[model samples]
Target chain A: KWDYDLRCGEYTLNLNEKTLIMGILNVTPDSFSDGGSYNEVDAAVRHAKEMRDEGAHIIDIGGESTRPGFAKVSVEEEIKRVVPMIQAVSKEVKLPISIDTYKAEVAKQAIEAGAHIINDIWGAKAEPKIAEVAAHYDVPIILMHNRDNMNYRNLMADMIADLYDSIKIAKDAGVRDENIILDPGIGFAKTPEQNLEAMRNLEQLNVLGYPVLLGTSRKSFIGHVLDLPVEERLEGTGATVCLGIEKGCEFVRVHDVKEMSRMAKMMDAMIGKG
Target chain B: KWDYDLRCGEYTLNLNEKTLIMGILNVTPDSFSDGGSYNEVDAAVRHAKEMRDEGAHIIDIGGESTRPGFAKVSVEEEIKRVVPMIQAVSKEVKLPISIDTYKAEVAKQAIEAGAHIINDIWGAKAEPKIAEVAAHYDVPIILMHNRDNMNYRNLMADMIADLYDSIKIAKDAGVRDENIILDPGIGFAKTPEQNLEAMRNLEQLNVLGYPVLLGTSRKSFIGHVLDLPVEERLEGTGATVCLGIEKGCEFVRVHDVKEMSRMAKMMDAMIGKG
Candidate 1:
C-alpha cells in the first residue's frame, strides 16, 4: 500500500519498522525549554550529537523564540542565531538538520547552510516565499496548522480550511506531492480547549493525504491544564505523543526524543499493523 | 451507549465523560520502584495522601512484590504490610482504596478493614476464593488478563478468550455485573513485545462489554522500549496513558497519579464524545 520511503536527502530513514524521533534544537536565548543553554555554534552541535546518539533521526534547529510574551526578532538576527548551528551539526551528524523558522529569508539561507527540511509554524501564511525555498531545495516541508484570525466560526472546520490553504501554497510553490507534512499546531493561537480538541481528533488532519506531524512538546496548554511548571510537563508531553501516534500521526517534533520514540513504537505495535 | 456508573461499594465512579486514574501504591520492600522507601506505614500513608492530593481517583495498594524474580511473603506479612496503611489512609483521605492482591485472605481482610475494591492480577485464577470474598463484601473486582500458559496459538485472540473465561468465573462466583472491571495485565507473564501489543490494542479488550483498565506504569515493557530506568519512565507512562484514553480505555493504573490525572483531563477535552 505504501509507495515511498521516508527519505531526507541521501538517507532513506528506515520507515518500515519503528516511529522516528526528531529532537528539538532551539537556538535562541528565549526559546521554551533549555533555552540559551545550547544556542551557540559549538553547544548546539554538541547537543545534536547527544540527541543523535540517543536515537534521534532528525535534529530540528530553531533560531527564533516563538514562546508567548517574547517579541519576535529581526530576520538578520534570526539568521545570525541559526546559521552556525545548522552548519556545525550538518557536518558533525549523519542525521538531517531541520530548520524551524517561518521567515522566507531565514528558511532560504538555512537550507543553503545545509539544513534538509523546513518546519514552518505559520504554514506559509506569514511568508509564502518560504514554500518556494523548500520547493527549490527539493526537501520535505512540514506545513503546520495555524491562523492569524483566532476566532473561528466552527473550530475544526476552520482549522482544516487553513491547512487546505497551506496545501495550495505548497503546490503553487512547486513542492512535490510526497514532500509535505501536516502538523496541527497545538498551542500557536488556539485556545487551551481548542488545543486539547486538536490533539484528541488529529486523524482529521491525516485525511488530507500527507504524513501528519504533531509537535506538542511541553506546550503551554499542557501546563495550563496540569497546573504544572514547564519543567514538570514531560509526562503531559508523552501523553500527547502517544495520542498522536494512536490517531495516525506519522512524525512527532519533540523535546524529549528518546521517550517519544519509544511511546510511538509501543502504540504502533498496539495497532497490530506494524 | 453506557447505562450505569461502575460502582465500587458505596462509591459511584461516573465513567460517562472520561476514565479514572488508579495511582499505584506499592507497600512492599523490594517490588520495583519506591519499595523500601514506602514500606513503612507512616511513609506509605504519606505517599497515599500525596497521590490523593495529586488527583488520583483511587489508591491501589499492593502489599506483595509482583516484579520478576519477586520474593514472595507470608500471608501474615502481607496483611501486616497493607492493613495498617489502608486503615491510616481510610481515616484521613476521601478516595477509595483498592487492594492489589491475588490472595483471598488478603482481599477478605482488606474489605473488612474498609477497602473498597479488589484488584486481582491473577484474575482470581491463583485463588478462586478471592472472587467469593469480593461477592461477599458486595465490592467491585478488577479481573485481569494473565497466564500460567505463555504458549499461545495466537496471542491477542487467546488473550480475549482467557479474559472471557475470567469474566465467566467472576459472574459464576456472584460478583455483580456493574462491579466487574477488566484489566489487560501488561507485564504479567508477557514478553516485552507482547505487552506492548496488548497495551496498544486495548480497544479490542474494550469490546468485551466491561470497563477496560490499563496498567503499564513503570512496567518492564516501558523500560525495555525506552531504555530508561524506572525513575525516568514517567514520560513514557504518560504517553501510553494518552494512547489508552484515545483508544477508548476507561481507566489507567499508573505510579504517577497527578500527572496522569492531568493527562486524562486534557485527553478528555480532546477526543471525548460527551
Candidate 2:
C-alpha cells in the first residue's frame, strides 16, 4: 500500500507487502474482576498469543475504554492497568505491541515496559508531550483523527487539516515521518452518515502521502447500516475492511483477528496487495 | 450495476439495485435424504423461507452437485430429484426459483414444475436447446462460461469470446438480451492463477452489455488461494463477492446466504448501490 518497512522494535514490517492486522487487546475490569490477578494477566497474554498465531501483525493493548459514553479512569490507574499486561505480553507474545493510550505518562511507562508503538486516539493533542515520548523512544506513533465537535465547514478537508496539525506536533517533537501513521477514527466525533461519507472517500487519505490505518472493527456505523446488534457485525466489518483496502489503507485494527486477517489477505490476493 | 428488471413469476427484480443474493439449495440424497419424504420437502421449503428471511432475493435449486468429478444422473432421475422440492417450495417460498441445470429436458420439467429461472453452467453450449427451453418459458437464463480444457491464447479475451459464443447461441434460440445474465464460472475451466486472473479482469464481461452473476461460493479456487478447507472459505468468498460488485456485477450466487447477503448489502451501502 505504501513504500515503507516500519521498524517497530526488532520487527521490520514492509507496508507495501500486505495489509497489516493489529489485534485489539482490551485490558479492563469487567463484570467479574479478579483485582488484577496473575490469572487476568495470563488471560491477556493468552489473547495476544492467540492473535499472533491467528495472523495478527501487531497487538494493540488498551487500558481505557474508548466506547461512546465510556467512563474515564485516573492516569495512574490507567498506567497501572496497561503496564502489567504490556510487560507480560511483551515476554509472551513475539509480535510488536502497541500501547493504546493518550496520556504521556501512560505512553512513557508503556514504552519502558516494552510497547513498540504508541496509538493515541486523541491525535497527540490531549497531551502534546506524548509526541515527545514517542520521539524519545524513537517508536512509530499512530496519530488518530479525533475531534471535540462534529461541526465543520468541510468534513474531509477539516479532518485532513486536523491530521496535519497532529503531524505538525509530532514532527515538532522530532518524530520521524516513517514513524507516523494516521487513523481517521471512524467512531469518534462523526455521525453515521459522516462515517459512511469518510469511508467512501478514504482515497483522499491515501493522497496525503502517508500509510493510513483503518480501525472500523465492530464500529457503530456497521451496526447502523446493517440494523443489527454489535455481536452480528463480523460480515459488515469485512465489507468495510475490503473497502478500506480498496481505498488504500495499509493497516487494519480489529477485534476479530482471524476473520479480518482472512478478509484482508483475500482482498490483497485479488488486488495484488502483497 | 445494470439497468434491467428481471421478471421471475410474480416478482420483478431490478438489477440496478443492491446486489442480489441467490441462495443455493442442493438436493442430494445423503444420510438424511429420507428418499422423497414429505419431511425432506418440508426441509427444503423451510430452508428457502430461512434464506428469504435472512435477505436472499432468489433460491437456486440444484439437482446435481457441480463440484469437480460429479457423477452424472439420468434425466428422469434428475427431474425426480428436483421436482418434489420445486413443487413444494414454489408454493411456500416467495422468492423466485432458479433451476441449476444444463439439460433441456430437466429445464423443461423444472419450469413446468414451477421453477422460474434457468441457470446453465455449460453456457448453453452443452445443450443449445437449453436456450430454447429458457425462451419457451420466457424466463431469464444465466449463461455461465465453462470449458472442457484450460488451453487459451489469451485468458480473458478467450473467455470473453467463449461467452460471446454463448450469447450467440442464446440469441439464436430467441432468448431476449434483457432476459440473459452472464457468469465468469470462477472454478470451472480455470486454474488457481487463472481464476484470480479471470476474477481481476471481470470488468470485460460488463462491456458485453449483460447483467453478471458471480458464483464464487465455497469453490475450490477460494480454497486454493486461502489454503483452507471448504467450510473455512466463507471469508474468502466475501472478498470475491465484494470484488465482483466492484467490477460491475449485479448478482452473487452463494451458499452462506445470511453472511454473504450481509457482506453484499454492506458493500452496496458503501458503494452507493440501491
Candidate 3:
C-alpha cells in the first residue's frame, strides 16, 4: 500500500503505480563502477542525458568513491567535481538531479547548481547540517542507513532504530516528513551475510511509513554471492531490483539503467496491482 | 514445496532448491528467435556447447517454427531437421537435451537420437501418441497448455483443466506422474492481455502439484507489452524469468542463455534461502 506522489523538486513520481528508476552517474574517477569513464563534466552530462533517454527518472551524480577502503575527497574537491555535472545535467535532461554526498557545503553548492535531491550516504549522522541544507532548499533527502561499526545486537531492530534516529535529525532540521526517503544502504557497514539478511527483511523498513529507495547495484554482496566481478553483475543487480520492487521499494538506484528500467516495469506489471 | 528429482536420462534436477535454465536452440530456418542461425549440425552442436558453458542446465532443440501463422513442417522433414542436431548436441554437451516437437514420429526419432526430454507445443492434443513416445523412452515430458481457439469459459480454470487433460493423456500413456512437467504456454492461443493474466496467476498452476516450467522468452506477449521487437526483448525476458521464479516456477526456457542463467542463479540466492 505504498500510495503517494514523491515530489523531488520539479519531478513528481507516483509510487505504488510503478517503480521509479534512478540511474547512477558517478563523476568520480575512482568510484566503484564506471570509474574514470564519465569524470569530465561534458561526459557526465552526456551519460545522464542518455540515461534519461533510456528511461531513468532520476540521475544520481556522485563525486566521491564510496567503495570500501577508498580514499576520501575533501569537501571543496567534492563540490568542484559534482556542481558542474549537476548544472550541465539539469539543463540537458529534464530528470531530477541527485547529489550523492553527505557534506553540508557540497549539498548546498550542488542544490544551488540545480540539483534536486540530496542522497546522503551517512544518513545525516556524519554531518547533521546536511539535513538543514536539504530543509532550506525544500528538496527531498534520502536518509541511508549506515553505521561506523558493523556490530548489531539485533540487526533488523537496530537498523530500524538507527533509521528512526536519522529521521529525528531530519525532523529537527525542519525537513518535512513527506519530503524524506529512506534507503536500507546495502554494502555499507555490513558483512555479505548481513546484507543478504537485510535484503530479505526489507519490508520491515516499511514500518517507518516512508518511501524506500534500494541501492544494491553491483555491490559487494552480489559479488560475494555470485563470485562475480563488477562488470559481470548485471543479472545479480537485476535480481536485487526485482526483490526490492516486490518488497515495496518505490525507487531503485542502479548503474544499468536500460535493463533495470525494463525489469522494474515488468515486475510492476506482474506484482504492482492493487 | 516441490521436492522431487527430475530424471532426464543421465541428468537429475532436484526441484525447489533453485530455478533451472532451459536454453532454446531452434534448428528451423524461419523460427522466431535465432532463426536459421543454427540449422547445421555443427552449428547446432557449437551453440549447445556455448549454452552449456554459459550455465544452461538444459538445451531445447526444435525443428519446426512455432510462431503464430507459421508454416507447418511435415514429420519426415521435421525429423530430418532435428535428429542430426540432437545427435550432435547430445555427444558434444554434457547437459540434457530436450526435443521440442508435437509429432509422435518426430519425438520417437529425436529420443532415439539422444534427446532426454520431450517438449510438446500441442500438449499432446494434436498428437496424443507423442506422450506414448515419451513414456516409451522413459523420458520426462513437458505438457504445455495450448488450444486451437483463444476462447475460454474461465481463463485460469480452463487453462488448468486443459493441462489436466494433457496430464490424463500422459497418465493413460503410462507416463509416470514424476516424469510430467506443466507449462503455462505464454503467447500460445491467447490474446496479449490473456498472456499477461496467465503470467500474473502462474502460482495458481502449482495446485496441480507438479513442477512448472515457464517459457516467455522473446514471445509476442513481451513484444506487445513493451512495444519492442524480438531483438530488444532480452531485458523484458529477464523480467518474466524473475517473476516466474517468484511465482514458484521450477524452470525457465529462454533465448539469451548467459543472461538468463545468471539471472536465475541470482534470484535463487535471494529467494531460495530457508
The clash count for each model shown is 1, 0, 0
Task: Please name the candidate that would achieve the greatest DockQ relative to the true structure.
Answer: 2
As for DockQ, the candidate ahead, 1 or 2, is 2
- Give the backbone clash total of model 3: 0
Q: Any residue pairs clashing in model 3, and if so which?
A: none
Docking class of 3: medium
Worst 10-residue lDDT window, candidate 3 chain A = A28-37
Per-model DockQ? 0.49, 0.72, 0.53
lDDT of 3 at A158: 94
Task: Rate residue B233 of model 2 by lDDT.
Answer: 95
Where model 2 places Cα greater than 4 Å from the true spot, the runs are A30-36, A65-69, B30-40, B65-69
Kindly report which residue pairs in candidate 2 clash with one another: none
Candidate 1, which CAPRI tier?
medium
- Minimum summed lDDT over a 10-residue window in model 2 chain A is located at A26-35
Best by TM-score: 2
Ranking by DockQ: 2, 3, 1
lDDT digits (tens) for residues B1-274 of candidate 2: 3556998878899887789999987554545552466766777888899899988998998876343456887787777778888988888888899999999999999999999999999999998999999988999999999989999899999999999999999999999998899999998888898998888788888889889999999888888778999999999999899889877898999989999998898888888887
Share of native C-alpha contacts between chains A and B (below 8 angstroms) recovered by candidate 3? 0.56
lDDT of 2 by residue, A130-236 (tens): 99999999999999999899997989999999999999999999999999999998988999989988888888987678889999988989999899988899999
